[PDB]
Structures are given as C-alpha cells and as structure tokens.
C-alpha cells in the first residue's frame, strides 16, 4: 500500500492549576501534522493558527451561540470531569517497589554500577538518593529518568558508579507521595 | 500546571480509521470501541466510578470524518508526511530468571496512526496474552503506542518487537534477551 493519507485530529485540552482554581480550555483542530485553528478560553474566541484555518475562525466567531458554549465549558466540561475523575486520576497513589542490586556479578574492588530500581509507582514525581555509609553521594549518579509504562505506572533506574570495598553499606532512599516516610533499601558489600 | 485532561479524536483517510479517547497526564483513561460501541476503561476499575455513553463518541467521529473531507479539499490534497517511530523494548520490572514479567514495546513519535506490531520469540510470532493500547496523543501531534507481552524470563529465549510503518524502509526489529 502506497496511497496518500489525510489525517484530522480534534483535541480538547483541560489544563488545571492549583486544583481547579484556574482552568484553561484549549480546543485544537489539526490537519495532518499542522494545527490550523484553536479556541483558547483565555482568549474567548477562535483564532486561526495557519491560513488554512482562517475560514473556520472567522466563521465560528460569527456565531455567538457557539462561543458561549465553549466559554462556559471551563465549568460544565473541564471542572466537571476533574470532579468526576479526581479520586482515580489526580489522587491516584501507587507505592513503588524498590530493589537494589549490582549490574555486574563480579569480585569486589572493581568498578560497578549499583542500581536502585524503583518500579510500579504513581504519580511520576519522585526523588531517589544514594547514600554510602550514611553519607549522600551526589556525583556519579546515572539515571534513566522517568519511564512511563502506559498502564498508569512509572519506573526508573537510578544507578551509582562505585568501586565497592568490603564492609561498605550502600543505601538507596526514595521519597514519593504514596508514602509518609522515605523508603530505604540497603546493599552491603 | 499540575494536570491536563485531553479528549483526543482522529479520523484517517482512506483507511477510515477513527478513534475517541481521554488522556490524563499522558495516560489513557478510556477509549470507545468504535465497532462494538462500548466504553473501554484502560483500568477496568475506572468504570466502577464513572460512566461514558459510547454512542456519543460516534457522532463526534461522523463530524470528524466530514470535516476531514472539507479540509483535504481546502489544502487541495496535501497528503500527510510519514514520520517513522522510535521503538524501545524494555521490561515492567528488573528481570529475574524464571519469574513472570512483561515485555513493553514502546512506539513513539510517529504519524499517521497506523502501525503493525508482532512479537517474536526466537523468530516465531507470539500472540498469547499480548495486549496493546490505542494511539495516544502528543503535543507535537505525533502519536505513541504501547504493546505488551507477558513472558517467563529465561536464558534460553530471545525476543524481538517487530514494527512496520510507512515511514520506515524495512520492518524494524528491536531486540531483547536476558544479559548477565
């Protein structure tokens, strides 16, 4: 199949600041990969993003029957949906499973990457810290960053560059809104 | 902000593929099975707290379809430019031999939203337990998609996620096998 494709996307974006104190509704019309016309509630009316969308902007703005529905949508649409889905979306909190292990199985006193795996958590915001004998190491930390699994869970790998000597105690500390006190997992060399 | 809820719809010609979904901070809340006219909650537990009339989405698609025709003509038939996907294969959690895990095939930054994915265990197609998400929206108006394969990790098997998209020259294979 080599036929040309033509794509039309319509997007209604509800942006929420400080709970629902501030809400911004954004309707977007996109042909192929180009946004052509949009309604921004901060603007109050349609605006052509490209020349292709001009006949729709000046046309839709001509009907105050349409503009009133959209302007009011910040309440009847955005705030309503926030209210309905708040308990299972906004307030969703799944605790991370934390494990610590060296990447390479090898004799001691050789360079190794100590990985602190943090998986299955929600929401995304999190902080992972490495400690060596009770002292925080800030250098030599390599992270995969935040990874979205697509099933309402995140995972991340925070690795510490080290040459583990015998007797050393390495501790990974995770802070996350799903727990009131930091999760700590230790690895003893 | 703190949060974003997105109602994202698309219609694509000549495929006649339509989609209707809600997105929350990058995750799918639900979509509508167009053929069967039912609401599909990404996590089934969601449908225990909220409802959506799937029938309403079909009129949206009808409007989307009509508007596409008009817009194709307006641009005098500028076809979409294919953007090939970045493919990544990873696992749900750290791999432990002989302990159930899940292979995630992440397909990102592509358009149009048509892709073909097949899992390969030692070069053979696997369908058992496979699941996939619908096409998820991006700010740059490209798409993302996830494919899943539950599997039992072992030193004996290798895996490939095979993705074919019009932007690619040949089918892409991202390789996974246990390493240690």
């Amino acid at each position: 199949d080599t036929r040309p494709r033509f794509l039309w996307q319509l997007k209604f974006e509800c942006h929420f600041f400080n709970g629902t104190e501030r809400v911004r509704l954004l309707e977007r019309c996109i042909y192929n990969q180009e946004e052509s016309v949009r309604f921004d509630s901060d603007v109050g009316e349609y605006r052509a993003v490209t020349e292709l969308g001009r006949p729709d902007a000046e046309y839709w703005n001509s009907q105050k029957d349409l503009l009133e529905q959209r302007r009011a949508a910040v309440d009847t649409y955005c705030r309503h949906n926030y209210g309905v889905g708040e308990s299972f979306t906004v307030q969703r909190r799944v605790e991370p499973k934390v494990t610590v292990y060296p990447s390479k199985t090898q004799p001691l006193q050789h360079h190794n990457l100590l990985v602190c795996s943090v998986s299955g958590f929600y929401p995304g915001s999190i902080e992972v810290r490495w400690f060596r004998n009770g002292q925080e190491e800030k250098a030599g930390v390599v992270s995969t960053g935040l990874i979205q699994n697509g099933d309402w869970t995140f995972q991340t790998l925070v690795m510490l560059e080290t040459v583990p000597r015998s007797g050393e105690v390495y501790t990974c500390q995770v802070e996350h809104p799903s727990v009131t006190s930091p999760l700590t997992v230790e690895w003893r060399a | 902000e703190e949060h974003v809820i997105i109602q994202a719809e698309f219609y694509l010609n000549p495929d006649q593929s339509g989609e209707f979904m809600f997105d929350f901070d990058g995750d799918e809340i639900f979509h509508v099975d167009m053929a069967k006219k039912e609401t599909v909650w990404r996590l089934e537990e969601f449908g225990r707290f909220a409802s959506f009339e799937a029938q309403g989405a079909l009129a949206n698609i009808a409007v989307d379809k009509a508007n596409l025709e008009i817009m194709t003509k307006r641009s005098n038939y500028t076809p979409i430019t294919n953007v090939p996907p970045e493919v990544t294969v990873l696992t749900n959690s750290p791999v432990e031999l002989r302990e159930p895990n899940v292979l995630i095939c992440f397909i990102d930054k592509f358009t149009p939203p048509v892709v073909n994915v097949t899992w390969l265990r030692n070069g053979k197609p696997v369908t058992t337990g496979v699941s996939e998400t619908v096409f998820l929206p991006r700010e740059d108006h490209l798409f993302r998609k996830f494919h899943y394969l539950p599997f039992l990790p072992s030193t004996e098997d290798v895996y490939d996620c095979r993705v074919e998209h019009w932007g690619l020259d040949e089918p892409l294979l991202k390789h996974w096998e246990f390493d240690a």
Binding site: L10, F12, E27, C29, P55, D56, Y59, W60, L66, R70, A73, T76, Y77, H80, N81, V84, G85 | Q7, E9, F22, I29, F30, F49, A50, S51, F52, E53, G56, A57, A59, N60, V63, D64, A66, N67, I70, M71
Partner: peptide, 14 residues
C-alpha cells in the same frame, strides 16, 4: 451524575 462529559466538534466552513 458521575458521567464523563465530552464536547463535540463544530462543522468546518464549507
């Protein structure tokens, strides 16, 4: 009323 509400797109010009 625990329904997820939705908006419908307007028809393009012509």
């Amino acid at each position: 009323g625990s329904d997820a509400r939705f908006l419908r797109g307007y028809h393009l010009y012509a």
